[PDB]
Amino acid sequence: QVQLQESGGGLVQPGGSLRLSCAASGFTFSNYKMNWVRQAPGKGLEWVSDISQSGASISYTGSVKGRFTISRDNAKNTLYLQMNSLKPEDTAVYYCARCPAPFTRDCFDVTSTTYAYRGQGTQVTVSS
Amino acid sequence: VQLVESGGGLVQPGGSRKLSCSASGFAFSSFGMHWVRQAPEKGLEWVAYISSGSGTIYYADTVKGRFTISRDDPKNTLFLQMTSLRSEDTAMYYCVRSIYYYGSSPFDFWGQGTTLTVSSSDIVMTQATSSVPVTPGESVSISCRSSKSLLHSNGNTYLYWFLQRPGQSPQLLIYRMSNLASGVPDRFSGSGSGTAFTLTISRLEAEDVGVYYCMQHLEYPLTFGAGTKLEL
Amino acid sequence: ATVSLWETVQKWREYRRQCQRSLTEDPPPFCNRTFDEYACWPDGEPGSFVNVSCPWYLPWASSVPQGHVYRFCTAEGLWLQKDNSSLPWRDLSECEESSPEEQLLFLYIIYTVGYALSFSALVIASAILLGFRHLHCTRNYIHLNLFASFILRALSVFIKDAALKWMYSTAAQQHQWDGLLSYQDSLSCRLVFLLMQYCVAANYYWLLVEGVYLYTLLAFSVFSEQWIFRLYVSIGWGVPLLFVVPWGIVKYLYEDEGCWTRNSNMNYWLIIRLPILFAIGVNFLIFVRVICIVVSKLKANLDIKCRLAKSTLTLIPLLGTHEVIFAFVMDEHARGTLRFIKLFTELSFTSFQGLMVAILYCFVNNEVQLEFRKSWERWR
Amino acid sequence: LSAEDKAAVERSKMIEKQLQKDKQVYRATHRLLLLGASGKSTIVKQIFETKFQVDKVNFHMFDVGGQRDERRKWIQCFNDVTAIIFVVASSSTNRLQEALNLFKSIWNNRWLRTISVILFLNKQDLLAEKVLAGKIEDYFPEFARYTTPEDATPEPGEDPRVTRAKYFIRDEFLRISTASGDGRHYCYPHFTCDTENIRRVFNDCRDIIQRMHLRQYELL
Amino acid sequence: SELDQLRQEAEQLKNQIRDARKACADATLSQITNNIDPVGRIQMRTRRTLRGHLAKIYAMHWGTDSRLLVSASQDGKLIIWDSYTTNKVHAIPLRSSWVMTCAYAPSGNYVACGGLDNICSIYNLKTREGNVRVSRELAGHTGYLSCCRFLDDNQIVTSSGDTTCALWDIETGQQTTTFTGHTGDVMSLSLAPDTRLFVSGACDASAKLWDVREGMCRQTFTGHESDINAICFFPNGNAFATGSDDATCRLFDLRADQELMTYSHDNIICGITSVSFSKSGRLLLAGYDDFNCNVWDALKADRAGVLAGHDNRVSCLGVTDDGMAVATGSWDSFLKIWN
Amino acid sequence: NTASIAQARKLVEQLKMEANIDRIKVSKAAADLMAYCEAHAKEDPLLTPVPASENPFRE
Ligand SMILES: Cc1cc(-n2nc3c(c2-n2ccn(-c4ccc5c(cnn5C)c4F)c2=O)[C@H](C)N(C(=O)c2cc4cc([C@H]5CCOC(C)(C)C5)ccc4n2[C@@]2(c4noc(=O)[nH]4)C[C@@H]2C)CC3)cc(C)c1F
């Protein structure tokens, strides 16, 4: 069964740091490329970051270049997102979402709250 | 659903006519069309056949050259141009719809026909009986014999059975020796093997008295039987 | 010198006819005025030594004008025979001894090895475009009978030079030359020559058809594939027939001799050379237009030297555009003996052109190699 | 030997003749897929489907607005299309990063790898006035290191900041298109708005048909 | 929150289901099928080739007389094929060019189709007016149709790409029932032999065994790890096979309620798109995206055969009801028929 | 947030209804599958090659 159990995240100080994670079970984690997807309160889901199968090719969205860093441990079958210098517009519910096909590059996984290869996600709040 | 023939009457021999068949109620351009006539005190016999798209035309041997069949697919109309008429061409002429795909039911619809009178090898389908007396209720069985085994290689015994009620267009009963046509009630049945054929009306009732014709369809020219008549 | 035995037996025919039409009105002059099919003889006289020139039908005929073959008929009516026979003293120490089957034998072997390798490469290409059934399209059908046309032209050239090899072998040991003179007198010779000229015109017009098909792929966006394919097969095969058989009949009517191969009035060779020149010129026009389209696509692509080089170098043998560098008739290459190297390179490229299209349009086409790889994996 | 099966084979030959006529009308029609996140009521002036005609060339437009947003299974069905007319609101929240990911997923999907994409950037006046009164630089930090290309034609009338943002979005789509591509399909960006954009779709589709016909002769 | 204790309860229920599946998992099908002989190198080969379409063939369904066969292509055509003599019977033009499915009725009278137009259209073949007519135009799904199968002459079950299957009454024209519970697009369904409980494979790697006469998902199978592209019930109706984009087939059992066999291979990195069993239930045929098909042994999990052939990806695959032939249909406009 | 909890309630209802079924042991089910394949191995024309005398796709 495709299971994506997230971890880490909550209230945090603006300017601070955080590292949230996704333990991915039920599939060969190395065959898939992974994404972090976020949903701001009120706004719809938007993409944050991609990491490929070997972890070589890597991508971020515009708004968080340099501030975040994605990594994957294919041995532990888990997906890490290290966030640094978080801003109050970056509060959202975070989602580890795998792209639906093995061994490919294309991804279609930011859909209208219906994409079953995407975990329950963690609330991550930047406030004071 | 609708075929009307036109152009009958009485013609001096040697002359020429054109029988027309206006079709309405079905997509005309995808049907082989047959002309089948009947001498006024005899049984049916086949005249001609134009295919769908007019790319294959067969005639009977007794009209081969004298008649010419064509069709106007925009006008939904069938044409029989009859030249050099004889005394034997005095007949009731019939325009028969007939589609040929797999599992199709050819010879299923028959126009009213026209009377066209003149005033001055093959498969032989041996009909079994001229006439047979019939009361309601029984299982009236009437046979038919071929001069050549109608069982082909592909297992399709090309024997058709036709009811003709008196004064009515001869409608189809059974296609390919075992299959009931559409609208035919269940009481009819067909059986037999090559050169041995049997129509059986088990549980007979009325609106059934007619002449039963036994059409070979293994090869052209399509020959019928002399017909067996039911009675009361 | 440039004289062969073909036109030599033509001149021997002309020599016999004029010498016959002269000696049938000879005055009375003891040998007679007999024609031994090798030398004319006038009204001979008893004890007379006739010293006539060498007969001009020889290949070495211009070489000895100052000499004179001389033969002396005695008063006994027959000259100095070798023995008791009817042969007179026909001694040829004065007329004693360059032909195009020696002067161009290097050129011969290079263009026949070019046509041989092209015939092999095109029959392999025709097999590799017919026997896969995935490669079947309108484009590969145009290529396919283009390949058939190269086969047919190379077979024309093979049958031509091998037939002359057989005829010079069967008349090299002989001098009576009779089947040759009756060969050129025959209509079978003219039918074979007309067939070869048809093969040549069909190859040039199938190059024209390839050009116009690639042009109507690029330019005419609105077209029918079916009707214009039938039209292009007709342009490729029938239009060469449509100007070859008027040429054949007008040469049959008006310059009948030489087995149609003398072309003195240059208009007659001109009416078969012009539509081939029209193919070459229109095909160059299409070559320029297609390379202009490719340059447009490359300068619009949001390093191009390699791609232009590959494009032009794969497009030239497909369209026959190389013949544009000698489509102009200059006739001034007879100064510095560059006419020989010009004829060399033009027959050489015309020979190798079939090989070049068979390797550039089957054997390095990626779709044919994909068909090889996928028919090899499902063969294991 | 085909007793009345001859008439069935004759029926099938008539079927094949009708399908030959349908092939002649099928390949003469250019299927193209309008995919966006109006640009369509400027086309019928001469709900899913559309058949129009430009310079006696049949174009065929299918809109997919009556599906869900899970695109990955029904977009495979357009592999035989000639072009995907991609529409992005050039002043998008950040919907246009979703547009970039959608374009990248179009561009790299293993059945759309022979499909060129006609890229339309609507609402360029909205982006012009937004950067005028401004936004976009907050979403994109890579926009600071960007210079307007010298070959980029300035649209006469608009600000230089409008041009640099405009051609930034265009060249960024081009960078995502050409980061992985074998030359088998290209991207044709334009800028709409109002008048007839369909001439650009005509010219584009002619470019795609010509590049396909050229590289199937190994000329590209 | 109360949503949190509901998710805790759902997690406890997944634990209870996984424990119950583990308790009844004594010996896998690979274990107790070592004592059976394999099948061998099966040289199935192309017998006919139905080369008539203009575009890619997206689906196919055999007749129940094992002779006729509907192919639906995306040139807007749906043409019945007489397989025995490779000649056409009907060539039906459609409304929308994008059909993604077809279905031949078991009575032989109707043919369904449907696609991106969100409509299952039912054409009547046996009309007495000549040409085929669209007999019914069922329009209630909100997404594209992906598969459709006739239960009988009167009622049709469809699956769509809006997470719903649906049982429709054709004579009235609306849904007798729905089947909701998927979380992704339902790419295929497959009926049982007794036509009382079918399965559906979807885009959430979960195959559901539904009940037709009720409308409730009675069993739910989670073995796969990508979008299930095809499903086919086993010929006795106790098991079924699936296949996905994860390059695997999976034989599940209904009564054992879990996955029995995973048909994978190292050289297979392409997703698979069409599965069917042979009449015995021994050869699991499975058409892939690498232009091939594979004849797996449903009990040895070995690649018993490899169907060669097609020049673009196979897209549909169907075994006759007498098990005589296997028809594949690909994106190269060709149907192949294999024995 | 209310559609979410209604979806959550129907998901938990579905899992309660789906957990509460009997399950035949996998050895017995796979024995039934093997017995079905072995009983009907004589009828299928794919693993048993039917000859050309009654294989209707051979011409
Ligand atoms: C090498 C070479 C040779 C030549 N060359 N130049 C000439 C000839 C040839 N020539 C052509 C073949 N050979 C030849 C002969 C014997 C050979 C070899 C090699 N080994 N052996 C043993 C050989 F190469 C030959 O000498 C012939 C002798 N000629 C002809 O006027 C001549 C005879 C002739 C006969 C037939 C046909 C009509 C129908 O029936 C037929 C029996 C088939 C005759 C067709 C065309 C013919 N023409 C032409 C011709 N001019 O060139 C050709 O090709 N044709 C003018 C017409 C275009 C004198 C000039 C030209 C080039 C450019 C070249 F590179």
Side-chain angles (χ1 to χ4, degrees), chain B residues 67-83:
Chain B
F67 294 180
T68 299
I69 181 176
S70 70
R71 58 186 291 166
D72 198 359
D73 296 329
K75 293 184 184 66
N76 297 326
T77 305
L78 188 69
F79 286 153
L80 183 61
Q81 188 63 44
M82 294 185 291
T83 62

mmCIF file with all atom_site columns, all heavy atoms in Angstrom, chain B residues 67-83:
data_model
loop_
_atom_site.group_PDB
_atom_site.id
_atom_site.type_symbol
_atom_site.label_atom_id
_atom_site.label_alt_id
_atom_site.label_comp_id
_atom_site.label_asym_id
_atom_site.label_entity_id
_atom_site.label_seq_id
_atom_site.pdbx_PDB_ins_code
_atom_site.Cartn_x
_atom_site.Cartn_y
_atom_site.Cartn_z
_atom_site.occupancy
_atom_site.B_iso_or_equiv
_atom_site.pdbx_formal_charge
_atom_site.auth_seq_id
_atom_site.auth_comp_id
_atom_site.auth_asym_id
_atom_site.auth_atom_id
_atom_site.pdbx_PDB_model_num
ATOM 1   N N   . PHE B 1 67 ? -32.387 -8.304 -69.776 1.00 0.00 ? 67 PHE B N   1
ATOM 2   C CA  . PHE B 1 67 ? -32.696 -7.374 -68.706 1.00 0.00 ? 67 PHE B CA  1
ATOM 3   C C   . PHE B 1 67 ? -31.409 -6.714 -68.244 1.00 0.00 ? 67 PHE B C   1
ATOM 4   O O   . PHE B 1 67 ? -30.308 -7.191 -68.515 1.00 0.00 ? 67 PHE B O   1
ATOM 5   C CB  . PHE B 1 67 ? -33.355 -8.060 -67.501 1.00 0.00 ? 67 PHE B CB  1
ATOM 6   C CG  . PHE B 1 67 ? -34.737 -8.628 -67.752 1.00 0.00 ? 67 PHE B CG  1
ATOM 7   C CD1 . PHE B 1 67 ? -35.398 -9.259 -66.719 1.00 0.00 ? 67 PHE B CD1 1
ATOM 8   C CD2 . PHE B 1 67 ? -35.396 -8.487 -68.956 1.00 0.00 ? 67 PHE B CD2 1
ATOM 9   C CE1 . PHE B 1 67 ? -36.660 -9.767 -66.889 1.00 0.00 ? 67 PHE B CE1 1
ATOM 10  C CE2 . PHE B 1 67 ? -36.654 -9.021 -69.137 1.00 0.00 ? 67 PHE B CE2 1
ATOM 11  C CZ  . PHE B 1 67 ? -37.287 -9.648 -68.096 1.00 0.00 ? 67 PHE B CZ  1
ATOM 12  N N   . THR B 1 68 ? -31.557 -5.600 -67.542 1.00 0.00 ? 68 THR B N   1
ATOM 13  C CA  . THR B 1 68 ? -30.406 -4.916 -66.974 1.00 0.00 ? 68 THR B CA  1
ATOM 14  C C   . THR B 1 68 ? -30.835 -4.215 -65.703 1.00 0.00 ? 68 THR B C   1
ATOM 15  O O   . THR B 1 68 ? -31.730 -3.372 -65.730 1.00 0.00 ? 68 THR B O   1
ATOM 16  C CB  . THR B 1 68 ? -29.811 -3.903 -67.949 1.00 0.00 ? 68 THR B CB  1
ATOM 17  O OG1 . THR B 1 68 ? -29.361 -4.580 -69.125 1.00 0.00 ? 68 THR B OG1 1
ATOM 18  C CG2 . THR B 1 68 ? -28.634 -3.193 -67.309 1.00 0.00 ? 68 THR B CG2 1
ATOM 19  N N   . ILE B 1 69 ? -30.197 -4.552 -64.609 1.00 0.00 ? 69 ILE B N   1
ATOM 20  C CA  . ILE B 1 69 ? -30.521 -3.988 -63.313 1.00 0.00 ? 69 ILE B CA  1
ATOM 21  C C   . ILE B 1 69 ? -29.519 -2.890 -62.987 1.00 0.00 ? 69 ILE B C   1
ATOM 22  O O   . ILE B 1 69 ? -28.325 -3.002 -63.288 1.00 0.00 ? 69 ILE B O   1
ATOM 23  C CB  . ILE B 1 69 ? -30.544 -5.098 -62.246 1.00 0.00 ? 69 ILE B CB  1
ATOM 24  C CG1 . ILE B 1 69 ? -30.897 -4.568 -60.865 1.00 0.00 ? 69 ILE B CG1 1
ATOM 25  C CG2 . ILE B 1 69 ? -29.267 -5.876 -62.232 1.00 0.00 ? 69 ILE B CG2 1
ATOM 26  C CD1 . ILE B 1 69 ? -31.024 -5.657 -59.859 1.00 0.00 ? 69 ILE B CD1 1
ATOM 27  N N   . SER B 1 70 ? -30.018 -1.794 -62.431 1.00 0.00 ? 70 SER B N   1
ATOM 28  C CA  . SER B 1 70 ? -29.160 -0.752 -61.896 1.00 0.00 ? 70 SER B CA  1
ATOM 29  C C   . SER B 1 70 ? -29.842 -0.176 -60.668 1.00 0.00 ? 70 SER B C   1
ATOM 30  O O   . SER B 1 70 ? -30.929 -0.601 -60.282 1.00 0.00 ? 70 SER B O   1
ATOM 31  C CB  . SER B 1 70 ? -28.878 0.334  -62.929 1.00 0.00 ? 70 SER B CB  1
ATOM 32  O OG  . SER B 1 70 ? -30.038 1.097  -63.180 1.00 0.00 ? 70 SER B OG  1
ATOM 33  N N   . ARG B 1 71 ? -29.200 0.802  -60.050 1.00 0.00 ? 71 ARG B N   1
ATOM 34  C CA  . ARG B 1 71 ? -29.777 1.423  -58.874 1.00 0.00 ? 71 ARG B CA  1
ATOM 35  C C   . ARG B 1 71 ? -29.262 2.845  -58.779 1.00 0.00 ? 71 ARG B C   1
ATOM 36  O O   . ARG B 1 71 ? -28.128 3.134  -59.165 1.00 0.00 ? 71 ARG B O   1
ATOM 37  C CB  . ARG B 1 71 ? -29.441 0.624  -57.611 1.00 0.00 ? 71 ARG B CB  1
ATOM 38  C CG  . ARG B 1 71 ? -27.958 0.457  -57.372 1.00 0.00 ? 71 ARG B CG  1
ATOM 39  C CD  . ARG B 1 71 ? -27.650 -0.458 -56.219 1.00 0.00 ? 71 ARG B CD  1
ATOM 40  N NE  . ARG B 1 71 ? -28.017 0.111  -54.935 1.00 0.00 ? 71 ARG B NE  1
ATOM 41  C CZ  . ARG B 1 71 ? -28.091 -0.599 -53.819 1.00 0.00 ? 71 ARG B CZ  1
ATOM 42  N NH1 . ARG B 1 71 ? -27.826 -1.894 -53.845 1.00 0.00 ? 71 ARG B NH1 1
ATOM 43  N NH2 . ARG B 1 71 ? -28.420 -0.018 -52.677 1.00 0.00 ? 71 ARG B NH2 1
ATOM 44  N N   . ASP B 1 72 ? -30.111 3.726  -58.296 1.00 0.00 ? 72 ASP B N   1
ATOM 45  C CA  . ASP B 1 72 ? -29.739 5.097  -58.005 1.00 0.00 ? 72 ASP B CA  1
ATOM 46  C C   . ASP B 1 72 ? -29.737 5.207  -56.490 1.00 0.00 ? 72 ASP B C   1
ATOM 47  O O   . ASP B 1 72 ? -30.799 5.291  -55.858 1.00 0.00 ? 72 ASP B O   1
ATOM 48  C CB  . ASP B 1 72 ? -30.698 6.090  -58.641 1.00 0.00 ? 72 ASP B CB  1
ATOM 49  C CG  . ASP B 1 72 ? -30.110 7.472  -58.722 1.00 0.00 ? 72 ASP B CG  1
ATOM 50  O OD1 . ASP B 1 72 ? -28.965 7.650  -58.273 1.00 0.00 ? 72 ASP B OD1 1
ATOM 51  O OD2 . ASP B 1 72 ? -30.769 8.379  -59.255 1.00 0.00 ? 72 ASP B OD2 1
ATOM 52  N N   . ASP B 1 73 ? -28.547 5.165  -55.916 1.00 0.00 ? 73 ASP B N   1
ATOM 53  C CA  . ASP B 1 73 ? -28.367 5.218  -54.475 1.00 0.00 ? 73 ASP B CA  1
ATOM 54  C C   . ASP B 1 73 ? -28.725 6.578  -53.874 1.00 0.00 ? 73 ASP B C   1
ATOM 55  O O   . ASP B 1 73 ? -29.208 6.602  -52.736 1.00 0.00 ? 73 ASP B O   1
ATOM 56  C CB  . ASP B 1 73 ? -26.934 4.827  -54.108 1.00 0.00 ? 73 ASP B CB  1
ATOM 57  C CG  . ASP B 1 73 ? -26.611 3.400  -54.469 1.00 0.00 ? 73 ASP B CG  1
ATOM 58  O OD1 . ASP B 1 73 ? -27.521 2.550  -54.450 1.00 0.00 ? 73 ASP B OD1 1
ATOM 59  O OD2 . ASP B 1 73 ? -25.438 3.128  -54.786 1.00 0.00 ? 73 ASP B OD2 1
ATOM 60  N N   . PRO B 1 74 ? -28.502 7.726  -54.540 1.00 0.00 ? 74 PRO B N   1
ATOM 61  C CA  . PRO B 1 74 ? -29.168 8.941  -54.047 1.00 0.00 ? 74 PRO B CA  1
ATOM 62  C C   . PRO B 1 74 ? -30.681 8.897  -54.120 1.00 0.00 ? 74 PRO B C   1
ATOM 63  O O   . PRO B 1 74 ? -31.343 9.359  -53.184 1.00 0.00 ? 74 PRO B O   1
ATOM 64  C CB  . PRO B 1 74 ? -28.591 10.039 -54.940 1.00 0.00 ? 74 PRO B CB  1
ATOM 65  C CG  . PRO B 1 74 ? -27.259 9.566  -55.253 1.00 0.00 ? 74 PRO B CG  1
ATOM 66  C CD  . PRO B 1 74 ? -27.377 8.102  -55.427 1.00 0.00 ? 74 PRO B CD  1
ATOM 67  N N   . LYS B 1 75 ? -31.262 8.349  -55.180 1.00 0.00 ? 75 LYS B N   1
ATOM 68  C CA  . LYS B 1 75 ? -32.717 8.355  -55.242 1.00 0.00 ? 75 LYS B CA  1
ATOM 69  C C   . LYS B 1 75 ? -33.353 7.206  -54.486 1.00 0.00 ? 75 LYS B C   1
ATOM 70  O O   . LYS B 1 75 ? -34.587 7.125  -54.481 1.00 0.00 ? 75 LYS B O   1
ATOM 71  C CB  . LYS B 1 75 ? -33.208 8.328  -56.683 1.00 0.00 ? 75 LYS B CB  1
ATOM 72  C CG  . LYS B 1 75 ? -32.896 9.580  -57.447 1.00 0.00 ? 75 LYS B CG  1
ATOM 73  C CD  . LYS B 1 75 ? -33.500 9.530  -58.824 1.00 0.00 ? 75 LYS B CD  1
ATOM 74  C CE  . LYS B 1 75 ? -33.090 10.742 -59.606 1.00 0.00 ? 75 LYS B CE  1
ATOM 75  N NZ  . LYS B 1 75 ? -31.622 10.709 -59.838 1.00 0.00 ? 75 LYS B NZ  1
ATOM 76  N N   . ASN B 1 76 ? -32.541 6.339  -53.865 1.00 0.00 ? 76 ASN B N   1
ATOM 77  C CA  . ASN B 1 76 ? -32.994 5.156  -53.125 1.00 0.00 ? 76 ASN B CA  1
ATOM 78  C C   . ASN B 1 76 ? -33.873 4.275  -53.996 1.00 0.00 ? 76 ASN B C   1
ATOM 79  O O   . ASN B 1 76 ? -34.940 3.820  -53.587 1.00 0.00 ? 76 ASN B O   1
ATOM 80  C CB  . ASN B 1 76 ? -33.724 5.536  -51.841 1.00 0.00 ? 76 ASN B CB  1
ATOM 81  C CG  . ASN B 1 76 ? -32.846 6.263  -50.879 1.00 0.00 ? 76 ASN B CG  1
ATOM 82  O OD1 . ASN B 1 76 ? -31.655 5.994  -50.790 1.00 0.00 ? 76 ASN B OD1 1
ATOM 83  N ND2 . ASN B 1 76 ? -33.430 7.175  -50.125 1.00 0.00 ? 76 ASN B ND2 1
ATOM 84  N N   . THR B 1 77 ? -33.440 4.069  -55.227 1.00 0.00 ? 77 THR B N   1
ATOM 85  C CA  . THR B 1 77 ? -34.337 3.565  -56.246 1.00 0.00 ? 77 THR B CA  1
ATOM 86  C C   . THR B 1 77 ? -33.640 2.458  -57.017 1.00 0.00 ? 77 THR B C   1
ATOM 87  O O   . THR B 1 77 ? -32.438 2.528  -57.262 1.00 0.00 ? 77 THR B O   1
ATOM 88  C CB  . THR B 1 77 ? -34.767 4.711  -57.154 1.00 0.00 ? 77 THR B CB  1
ATOM 89  O OG1 . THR B 1 77 ? -35.337 5.745  -56.347 1.00 0.00 ? 77 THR B OG1 1
ATOM 90  C CG2 . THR B 1 77 ? -35.818 4.275  -58.116 1.00 0.00 ? 77 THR B CG2 1
ATOM 91  N N   . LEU B 1 78 ? -34.383 1.416  -57.345 1.00 0.00 ? 78 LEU B N   1
ATOM 92  C CA  . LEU B 1 78 ? -33.858 0.279  -58.077 1.00 0.00 ? 78 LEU B CA  1
ATOM 93  C C   . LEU B 1 78 ? -34.505 0.239  -59.451 1.00 0.00 ? 78 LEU B C   1
ATOM 94  O O   . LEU B 1 78 ? -35.694 0.524  -59.591 1.00 0.00 ? 78 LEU B O   1
ATOM 95  C CB  . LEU B 1 78 ? -34.139 -1.010 -57.326 1.00 0.00 ? 78 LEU B CB  1
ATOM 96  C CG  . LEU B 1 78 ? -33.492 -2.272 -57.850 1.00 0.00 ? 78 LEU B CG  1
ATOM 97  C CD1 . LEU B 1 78 ? -32.026 -2.148 -57.615 1.00 0.00 ? 78 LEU B CD1 1
ATOM 98  C CD2 . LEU B 1 78 ? -34.038 -3.465 -57.138 1.00 0.00 ? 78 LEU B CD2 1
ATOM 99  N N   . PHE B 1 79 ? -33.724 -0.121 -60.461 1.00 0.00 ? 79 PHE B N   1
ATOM 100 C CA  . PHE B 1 79 ? -34.127 -0.070 -61.854 1.00 0.00 ? 79 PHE B CA  1
ATOM 101 C C   . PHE B 1 79 ? -33.957 -1.438 -62.481 1.00 0.00 ? 79 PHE B C   1
ATOM 102 O O   . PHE B 1 79 ? -32.885 -2.036 -62.384 1.00 0.00 ? 79 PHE B O   1
ATOM 103 C CB  . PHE B 1 79 ? -33.273 0.935  -62.610 1.00 0.00 ? 79 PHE B CB  1
ATOM 104 C CG  . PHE B 1 79 ? -33.603 2.351  -62.317 1.00 0.00 ? 79 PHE B CG  1
ATOM 105 C CD1 . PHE B 1 79 ? -32.634 3.331  -62.440 1.00 0.00 ? 79 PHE B CD1 1
ATOM 106 C CD2 . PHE B 1 79 ? -34.868 2.706  -61.891 1.00 0.00 ? 79 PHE B CD2 1
ATOM 107 C CE1 . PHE B 1 79 ? -32.925 4.643  -62.172 1.00 0.00 ? 79 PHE B CE1 1
ATOM 108 C CE2 . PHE B 1 79 ? -35.168 4.018  -61.628 1.00 0.00 ? 79 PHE B CE2 1
ATOM 109 C CZ  . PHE B 1 79 ? -34.192 4.988  -61.760 1.00 0.00 ? 79 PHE B CZ  1
ATOM 110 N N   . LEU B 1 80 ? -34.996 -1.919 -63.137 1.00 0.00 ? 80 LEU B N   1
ATOM 111 C CA  . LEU B 1 80 ? -34.895 -3.103 -63.977 1.00 0.00 ? 80 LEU B CA  1
ATOM 112 C C   . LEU B 1 80 ? -35.338 -2.693 -65.372 1.00 0.00 ? 80 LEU B C   1
ATOM 113 O O   . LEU B 1 80 ? -36.523 -2.440 -65.598 1.00 0.00 ? 80 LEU B O   1
ATOM 114 C CB  . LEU B 1 80 ? -35.739 -4.246 -63.444 1.00 0.00 ? 80 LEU B CB  1
ATOM 115 C CG  . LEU B 1 80 ? -35.564 -5.499 -64.295 1.00 0.00 ? 80 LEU B CG  1
ATOM 116 C CD1 . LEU B 1 80 ? -34.120 -5.946 -64.255 1.00 0.00 ? 80 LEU B CD1 1
ATOM 117 C CD2 . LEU B 1 80 ? -36.477 -6.607 -63.838 1.00 0.00 ? 80 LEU B CD2 1
ATOM 118 N N   . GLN B 1 81 ? -34.387 -2.599 -66.293 1.00 0.00 ? 81 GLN B N   1
ATOM 119 C CA  . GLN B 1 81 ? -34.670 -2.258 -67.677 1.00 0.00 ? 81 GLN B CA  1
ATOM 120 C C   . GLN B 1 81 ? -34.837 -3.552 -68.451 1.00 0.00 ? 81 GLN B C   1
ATOM 121 O O   . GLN B 1 81 ? -33.877 -4.302 -68.632 1.00 0.00 ? 81 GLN B O   1
ATOM 122 C CB  . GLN B 1 81 ? -33.545 -1.417 -68.263 1.00 0.00 ? 81 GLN B CB  1
ATOM 123 C CG  . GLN B 1 81 ? -33.889 -0.897 -69.622 1.00 0.00 ? 81 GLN B CG  1
ATOM 124 C CD  . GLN B 1 81 ? -35.073 0.030  -69.558 1.00 0.00 ? 81 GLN B CD  1
ATOM 125 O OE1 . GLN B 1 81 ? -35.162 0.877  -68.673 1.00 0.00 ? 81 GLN B OE1 1
ATOM 126 N NE2 . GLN B 1 81 ? -36.010 -0.146 -70.475 1.00 0.00 ? 81 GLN B NE2 1
ATOM 127 N N   . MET B 1 82 ? -36.048 -3.816 -68.906 1.00 0.00 ? 82 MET B N   1
ATOM 128 C CA  . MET B 1 82 ? -36.392 -5.092 -69.503 1.00 0.00 ? 82 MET B CA  1
ATOM 129 C C   . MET B 1 82 ? -36.579 -4.936 -71.001 1.00 0.00 ? 82 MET B C   1
ATOM 130 O O   . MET B 1 82 ? -37.553 -4.327 -71.443 1.00 0.00 ? 82 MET B O   1
ATOM 131 C CB  . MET B 1 82 ? -37.665 -5.636 -68.878 1.00 0.00 ? 82 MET B CB  1
ATOM 132 C CG  . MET B 1 82 ? -37.513 -5.987 -67.442 1.00 0.00 ? 82 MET B CG  1
ATOM 133 S SD  . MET B 1 82 ? -39.032 -6.726 -66.888 1.00 0.00 ? 82 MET B SD  1
ATOM 134 C CE  . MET B 1 82 ? -40.019 -5.265 -66.990 1.00 0.00 ? 82 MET B CE  1
ATOM 135 N N   . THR B 1 83 ? -35.679 -5.518 -71.775 1.00 0.00 ? 83 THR B N   1
ATOM 136 C CA  . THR B 1 83 ? -35.748 -5.438 -73.221 1.00 0.00 ? 83 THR B CA  1
ATOM 137 C C   . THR B 1 83 ? -35.981 -6.822 -73.798 1.00 0.00 ? 83 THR B C   1
ATOM 138 O O   . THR B 1 83 ? -35.588 -7.826 -73.200 1.00 0.00 ? 83 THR B O   1
ATOM 139 C CB  . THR B 1 83 ? -34.469 -4.856 -73.806 1.00 0.00 ? 83 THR B CB  1
ATOM 140 O OG1 . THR B 1 83 ? -33.371 -5.714 -73.481 1.00 0.00 ? 83 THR B OG1 1
ATOM 141 C CG2 . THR B 1 83 ? -34.211 -3.474 -73.232 1.00 0.00 ? 83 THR B CG2 1
#
